[PDB]
Amino acid sequence: KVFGRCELAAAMKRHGLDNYRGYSLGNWVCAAKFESNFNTQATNRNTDGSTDYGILQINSRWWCNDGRTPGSRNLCNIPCSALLSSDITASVNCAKKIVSDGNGMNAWVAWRNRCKGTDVQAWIRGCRL
Ligand SMILES: [Cl-]
Ligand code: NA
Ligand code: NA
């Protein structure tokens, strides 16, 4: 399922992302846009066994388990398939685990590159009427 920009931003605000660990809402929409293009079903079969999953393109090497990434971790204790659900809640909760450990959103390359310097409050403008 591909979210509308404001559809997504609303949900991300209901999932408590607004300023979560120092990161305003537009940040989260900006990384979602530039990781998956708002599509909860986005995958990216990284060259080795690893695979980026869902709206925030979570990597199976570290966070979830697909059953195909030898000696990966599962730091969210979820199977990857759950990220592709079209609900963002699983993707959103594992992301909160990622931003606290201390990088934080730098953990997402698309955020690090396409969002860091931009004016990010623009990714949520016009979404209230
Ligand atoms: Cl913002
Ligand atoms: Na695995
Ligand atoms: Na979780």
93: Cβ–Cβ under 8 A, 6 or more apart, which residues? Answer: 15, 76
Percentages (nearest 5) of helix, strand, coil residues in the chain = 40, 10, 50
Annotated binding site: 101
Domain ranges of the chain: 1-129
Proximal ligand: closest to the CA of 82: 3
> Is the backbone of residue 2 left (phi > 0), alpha (psi -120 to 50) or beta?
beta
Ligand nearest to the CA of 124: 1
Q: In angstroms, how far is the first alpha carbon of the chain from the final one?
A: 24
Chain-centroid distance, C-alpha 21: 15
Write down the catalytic residue from 7, 18, 35, 48.
35
Resolution reading in Å: 2.7
- Distance in Å, CA 5 to ligand 3 centroid: 24
7 a catalytic residue = no
- Statement: 1-129 belongs to CATH 1.10.530.10: yes
Selection from 19, 102, 76, 67 nearest residue 56 by Cα: 76
